[PDB]
Amino acid sequence: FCRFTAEGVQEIDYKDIATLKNYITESGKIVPSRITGTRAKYQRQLARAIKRARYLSLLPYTDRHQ
Amino acid sequence: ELQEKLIAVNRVSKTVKGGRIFSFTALTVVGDGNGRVGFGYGKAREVPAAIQKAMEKARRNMINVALNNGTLQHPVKGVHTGSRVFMQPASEGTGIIAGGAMRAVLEVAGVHNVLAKAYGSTNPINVVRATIDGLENMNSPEMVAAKRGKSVEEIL
Amino acid sequence: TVSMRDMLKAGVHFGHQTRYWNPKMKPFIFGARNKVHIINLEKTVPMFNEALAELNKIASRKGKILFVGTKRAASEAVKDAALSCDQFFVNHRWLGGMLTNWKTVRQSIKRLKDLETQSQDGTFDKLTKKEALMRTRELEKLENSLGGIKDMGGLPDALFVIDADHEHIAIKEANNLGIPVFAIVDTNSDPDGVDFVIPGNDDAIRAVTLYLGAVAATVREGRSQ
Amino acid sequence: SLSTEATAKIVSEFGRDANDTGSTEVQVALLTAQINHLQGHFAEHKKDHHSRRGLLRMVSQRRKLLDYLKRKDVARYTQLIERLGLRR
Amino acid sequence: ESFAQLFEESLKEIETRPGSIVRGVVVAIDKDVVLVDAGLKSESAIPAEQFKNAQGELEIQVGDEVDVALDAVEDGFGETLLSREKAKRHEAWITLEKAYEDAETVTGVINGKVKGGFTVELNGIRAFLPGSLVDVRPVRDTLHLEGKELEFKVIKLDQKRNNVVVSRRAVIESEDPWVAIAKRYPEGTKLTGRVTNLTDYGCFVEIEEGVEGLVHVSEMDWTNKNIHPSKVVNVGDVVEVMVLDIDEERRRISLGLKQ
Amino acid sequence: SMQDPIADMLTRIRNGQAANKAAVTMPSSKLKVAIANVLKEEGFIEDFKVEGDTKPELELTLKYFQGKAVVESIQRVSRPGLRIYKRKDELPKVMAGLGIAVVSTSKGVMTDRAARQAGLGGEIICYVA
Amino acid sequence: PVIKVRENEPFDVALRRFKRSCEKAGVLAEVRRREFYEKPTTERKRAKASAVKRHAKKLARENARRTRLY
RNA sequence: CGGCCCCCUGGACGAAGACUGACGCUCAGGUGCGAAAGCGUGGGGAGCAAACAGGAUUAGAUACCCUGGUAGUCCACGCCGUAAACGAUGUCGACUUGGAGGUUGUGCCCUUGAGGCGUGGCUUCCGGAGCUAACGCGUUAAGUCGACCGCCUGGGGAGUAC
């Protein structure tokens, strides 16, 4: 039950923070493709986006850090 | 009318808590001196019983073999497990030139004239089986004609 | 004899799901509707007719038919079919080596018969309660197993089967001895052991009944002849 | 890889029809150019072994093509090797 | 001939996949198993509990016709998913009928809110609606005679996840689950959910528009460990459950049943 | 790479026989066609049919007698690795005359017996039984 | 697993919640994993072995299930 | 071969077309790449840790366990050329029943929805015929064949001596 297949997105955006936030943990970790049911191709992209965000301090690497 | 030859009898063991329980295997083969052959492999605590069992086995599940007179119809290979066997038809007078288990099966089958070598393994049980297979597969001229949609004179 | 329309109504044309099929049943299959295999009734019917004819012929020479169906849905029905044409049957689990090992099973049959006699003809009663109970239980067991085949005497001259994959042991036994086999064979089943294959729905009850009934009729006809 | 425009240019020059592209000579030229390009890369990056494998393969292919040309038609081959400046 | 080919496309034309065409004739009844034949490869093993109406006893003898459902084929041997869901489509059609004249009228009787909306029951089934839907104003049916007779006037429906809150009394008055997972959230919002499969540690009740709930084994009852959930509740049944916990991230809404 | 077309054809035929295939198709060649014809004559196949202009496909139609296959055995003898040429006296007898040996001679491809009759030997293509 | 006790929330409940959070995180498990160095090979082996086991559980057992026990 | 980014760069696959026209397959010698450890010169050195030291354990404990700990692991440029370098399965091509997946394209179809019907590439598991000493392999063959190469000929002595 993938979101990105239905939406039909060409590429996942690191700037689209809200969307990312659904796929990240309360502890900051990226959520598995088993749980979200994201398609494999998209999942990787999502992960990449998240990573990018983390570099730009848009998303946090973890809950504890400060 | 049926002739029956006990090829081999072998003592086989099973280890148990006490020690070794021994038993006997009898390999026999029976035939009517014509196409019909059948081998039987019987097992029992005593030899004679085992032999009897083997004979019984043999007597059912026989198999027919097309024999051109006293000999085979063409050279035939037969394989089974280790034992791979070649047997070749031969002129009247030559006798059964074949070794061991193989000979016995031939004799009962009512082949009188063969040139037969057992390559590979010569484990009696396997070799007899191989021989049987060879005999079975061997097709006659008439049969071949039937298969091919021809007369016997067309094939020669 | 049996029409195509009737068969269709029954649900003969339906088969099993596509993932459970046997590719040896690819000739008898027509297509796949809703991911479920459809048996070709054009190829089935003539075969069925032939089988029926064969059965009739067998009957005519005083042949013994054995009706096998241990599905538990069509156990009631097969027995009924058997009884209509006064033939023998195995509606509960086929005893491994019923036919191949007849001589042992002949003893069992005899025992059963004896038990029955004791129950009915003796009218002795006066038996220790536990022992009596045990005896009764034994009788029940025997009846369930060998009730249809108690009057068979020897081996049957033909073997009608409701499912080939389910009764493969029986089929195998029939092949070893060389008894003609008349199997109803769904798409999942293997037709190679069967002599007179009948491509049709083993599972559906109505279809099974239909299959039985025609066969029974043919047997009766043969007997009459 | 070789840029599209460059490739096109190469094809036009060596190819008779210019739409042809698959002419032996054209192919050779294409290979050669690529090889030349990669020389610069490999001077810089001596440990890039994986990449160099591809280059080697390309070279081999080119050689094969040349050989083929030679047996078929000698003059053409000679011309080609003059144009490209291939020692053999 | 092509008689059969044409007959095949004919029979394709005169059936469909869902429980739509009321076709299976009940051809054997035995407690506790009904069985039909809707022109499928095999007969359904129907429960008796998809067919007793509103007080516990059976309603349909031999020959009677209800459609079932489909799109799932062969678990080993057999054919269907249950006809009772069939019924849900009919209910949906009646609810939809409202749209035409902007007023669906039956009877709705809603005594109380498991999760903030009185429960309304139509015919056999009972549904849960959001808190406003029960009353047109602030009237509140707590002062009304218990389990009172009105109808239902619809207040709110969730359109994906099936929750419908309907309007008792006042006759005169006339990606996708996981972003905004804050609706049934706040601590203990009770829900009505059908269980799906009980995995010997769990029960998997999950209804609210493409989510997954567990109610695992620890609550379920008021005994902890010796319980074995197959004994204690059901298979395929709409129950009392509420959230107790949502993680919108590692989609594990952990519902409960001891409440 | 494809090195021996005749051999390949033979293999295909064998596989068809094994797998109870009605007809066996392959890319056509003149030699192959000839072989097929020979087979037909000798009665190991039902019929052969070449079809196409640019790249034609030979289609043999295999034969089955009493369930089992007709072509009991079919081996190449000459092969690209190691060629076999026989003189008319040295020509073989497959299955003691019951099978046939396809032999390519100066006067076209023919069965061994035919070749013998003619009075000429040649390259031994395949034994068929 | 950062948590804040809600207004008029019991202590025990809070503790339970915290525990749950921890479990979700898989923090303890992670710690256990990083206690000692696992050779890459060993890691690989475990993963594949585990996968195999899972597969066995899924399919073979399902096949078994089809047939009744008594 | 595993954070993220950029620059240079090799291969794979699909979609249609268009072109070249057997240019192919395999390969003794030859050439290159080739884990870890190891070597050389120059850097670096957190953690880990051969060696080493102490503390235990023990009959002993030149080990396992504990506390420390140096080469080394890291980088640059050279050398080494071996591993259960394994799928213990040479490369290339053709042919022979099926099922359940994964991954990555792509054509059509009302995408009426996460779908429906195909068609390509790579890939995991199960299993048929056949094969196999059996175990098992089974369209990714260990089946049926062809082309080329490599290699084996009882165990030890020995992959050692010269």
What's phi and psi for B80, nearest 5 deg? -160, 110
**What is the total count of domains within chain F?**
2
Q: Which of residues 20-59 of D touch strand H (CB under 7 A)?
A: 20-24, 34, 37-38, 41, 44-51, 53-58
Cβ within 8 Å of A, G 18-37: 21, 24-25
CB contact under 8 A, B74 and F96: yes
Parse chain B into domains and list their residue ranges.
3-63, 64-148
Judge whether C39 and C13 are in contact, CB under 8 Å. Answer: yes
Q: Minimal Cα–Cα distance from G40 to chain A, Å?
A: 22
CB atoms within 10 A of CB C183: 31
- Asked if strand H comes closer than 7 Å to F119 Cβ, the answer is no
Judge whether C184 and C71 are in contact, CB under 8 Å. Answer: no
- Asked if strand H comes closer than 7 Å to A6 Cβ, the answer is yes
Contacts of E76 in chain G (CB under 8 A): 66
Give the helix/strand (H/E) hosting B86: strand B83-89
The residue range of the domain holding F92 is 72-129
- Which residues are paired to E253 by β-bridges? E213
Helix axes B124-137, B101-109, angle to 10 degrees: 40
Contacts of G24 in chain E (CB under 8 A): 247, 250, 252
Judge whether B101 and B117 are in contact, CB under 8 Å. Answer: no
* B64-148 topology per CATH: Ribosomal Protein S5; domain 2 (3.30.230)
Judge whether A3 and A38 are in contact, CB under 8 Å. Answer: yes
- Asked if strand H comes closer than 7 Å to A40 Cβ, the answer is yes
Do B and F have ≥3 inter-chain CB pairs under 8 A? yes
Minimum Cα–Cα distance from G21: chain E residue: E247
- Asked if strand H comes closer than 7 Å to C31 Cβ, the answer is no
Judge whether E195 and E233 are in contact, CB under 8 Å. Answer: yes
Give the Cα separation of E63 and E41 in Å (integer): 19
Cβ contacts of E45 within 8 Å, gap of 6 or more: E33, E35, E78
Burial class (CB in 10 A: 0-12, 13-18, 19+), D65: buried
- F64 plus F83 within the same structural domain: no
- Burial pattern B72-90, b for ≥16 Cβ within 10 A else e, equals bbbbbebbbeebbbbbbbb
Q: Does B147 contact F at CB distance below 8 Å?
A: yes
Judge whether C69 and C163 are in contact, CB under 8 Å. Answer: yes
Cβ contacts of E131 within 8 Å, gap of 6 or more: E113, E116, E117, E118, E165
Give the Cα separation of D68 and C15 in Å (integer): 60
CB contact under 8 A, C34 and E17: yes
- Asked if strand H comes closer than 7 Å to F1 Cβ, the answer is yes
> Which chains does G contact via 3+ CB–CB distances below 8 A?
A, E
Name the closest residue (CA) to the C1' of nucleotide H10: D51
Q: Please report, rounded to whole angstroms, the spatial distance between the CA atom of protein residue A23 and the C1' atom of nucleotide H16.
A: 39
CATH architecture of C102-146: Orthogonal Bundle (1.10)
By C-alpha distance, which of E187, E219, E177 is closest to E202?
A: E219
Give the Cα separation of E70 and B51 in Å (integer): 63
Judge whether F128 and F73 are in contact, CB under 8 Å. Answer: yes
Give the Cα separation of F19 and F8 in Å (integer): 16
CATH architecture of B3-63: 2-Layer Sandwich (3.30)
- Asked if strand H comes closer than 7 Å to F67 Cβ, the answer is no
Q: Minimal Cα–Cα distance from E248 to chain G, Å?
A: 12
Measuring from the CA of residue D52 to each C1' atom, give the nucleotide at the shortest distance.
H10
Question: For residue E46, what are the CA distances in angstroms to C7, E61, E74?
Answer: 24, 14, 15
Laid out side by side, the sheet with C29-33 consists of: C14-17, C36-39, C29-33
Cβ contacts of C153 within 8 Å, gap of 6 or more: C64
Q: Minimal Cα–Cα distance from E245 to chain G, Å?
A: 9
Measuring from the CA of residue C190 to each C1' atom, give the nucleotide at the shortest distance.
H128
CB contact under 8 A, F97 and B146: no
Residue C35: both structure tokens together: 């991911």
Give the Cα separation of B103 and B109 in Å (integer): 10
Residue C1 identity? T
Give the Cα separation of G20 and C162 in Å (integer): 56
Give the Cα separation of E110 and E155 in Å (integer): 13
Contacts of C203 in chain E (CB under 8 A): 41-42, 77
Entry resolution in angstroms? 4.1
Burial class (CB in 10 A: 0-12, 13-18, 19+), C163: buried
Number of A to G CB contacts under 8 A, please give it. Answer: 12
CB atoms within 10 A of CB B133: 18
SS3 per-residue string spanning chain A: CCHHHHHCCCCCCCCCHHHHHHHECCCCCECCHHHHCCCHHHHHHHHHHHHHHHHCCCCCCCCCCC
Residue E126: both structure tokens together: 């009972």
- F87 plus F51 within the same structural domain: no
Cβ contacts of B12 within 8 Å, gap of 6 or more: B22, B23, B24, B25, B43
Strands, E, within E98-252: which ranges?
A: 119-122, 125-128, 154-157, 164-166, 193-194, 238-239
User: At which residue do the structure tokens 């070649």 appear?
Assistant: B86
**What is the total count of domains within chain D?**
1
Give the Cα separation of E249 and A30 in Å (integer): 9
Judge whether F88 and F121 are in contact, CB under 8 Å. Answer: yes
CB contact under 8 A, F65 and B146: yes
Q: Minimal Cα–Cα distance from A13 to chain E, Å?
A: 15
Cβ contacts of A47 within 8 Å, gap of 6 or more: A30
Judge whether E195 and E205 are in contact, CB under 8 Å. Answer: yes
Parse chain G into domains and list their residue ranges.
1-56
Give the Cα separation of C82 and C89 in Å (integer): 6
User: At which residue do the structure tokens 């769904």 appear?
Assistant: C186
Judge whether B121 and B83 are in contact, CB under 8 Å. Answer: yes
What is C43-69 written as a DSSP string? HHHHHHHHHHHHHHHHHHTTPPEEEE-
By C-alpha distance, which of F34, F12, F28 is closest to F102?
A: F34
CB atoms within 10 A of CB F50: 14
